[PDB]
DNA sequence: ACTCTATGATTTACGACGCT
DNA sequence: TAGCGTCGTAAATCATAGAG
């Protein structure tokens, strides 16, 4: 029957998920206090300093937005 | 003290997996009725979504170990 | 109590769409 | 077009309720 068949699935050459590291997420932390927002160059720096592409940079910084929203619904009741 | 993490009531499950089984070939409820279901089960829409995300691949990845549950519903 | 594992929550990675 | 923003979700992983 397949009823999942309409559902959304992730595209068989997405990257496989890899939880980062204690080290690797305390410094990102750090990195967005300091501005949430990142340019180009502080995304590289970062990057190369914690062995993770831009692209993961950029996205994390992205989901940790999503987060902070997301804690933020969830007082304002 | 913080608030713990809890398995949901044999109601409110009820109620989930009624909707979920009753739109199975696309189990996607909108904003609203997330909220509606939000208030069925006395949780919270985030919760509702975090149960349709695990329940959604849990099923698919064993659609025979939710058969009869599919039927009962 | 003390494992185990079921289940609600959180974390990566994207697709689809917005705008400049 | 390049490229970064949000929104919603998939799938993997976490945390620890709770069931023996």
Redo the contacts between chains.
């Keep these: 029957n397949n009823?999942?068949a309409?559902?959304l699935h992730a595209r068989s050459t997405r990257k496989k998920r890899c939880p980062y590291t204690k080290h690797q997420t305390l410094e990102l932390e750090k990195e967005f206090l300091f501005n949430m927002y990142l340019t180009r160059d502080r995304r590289y720096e970062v990057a190369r300093l914690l062995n993770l592409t831009e692209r993961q940079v950029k996205i994390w910084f992205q989901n940790r937005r999503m987060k902070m929203k997301?804690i933020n619904?969830?007082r304002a009741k | 003290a913080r608030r713990k993490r809890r398995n949901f009531n044999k109601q409110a499950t009820e109620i989930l997996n009624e909707y979920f089984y009753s739109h199975?070939?696309?189990?996607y409820p909108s904003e609203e009725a997330k909220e509606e279901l939000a208030k069925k089960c006395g949780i919270?829409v985030?919760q509702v979504s975090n149960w349709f995300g695990n329940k959604?691949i849990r099923?698919?990845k064993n659609?025979g170990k939710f058969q009869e549950e599919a039927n009962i519903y």
């Design positions: 009823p999942a309409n559902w997301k619904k969830d | 199975l070939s696309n189990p919270t985030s959604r099923y698919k659609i």
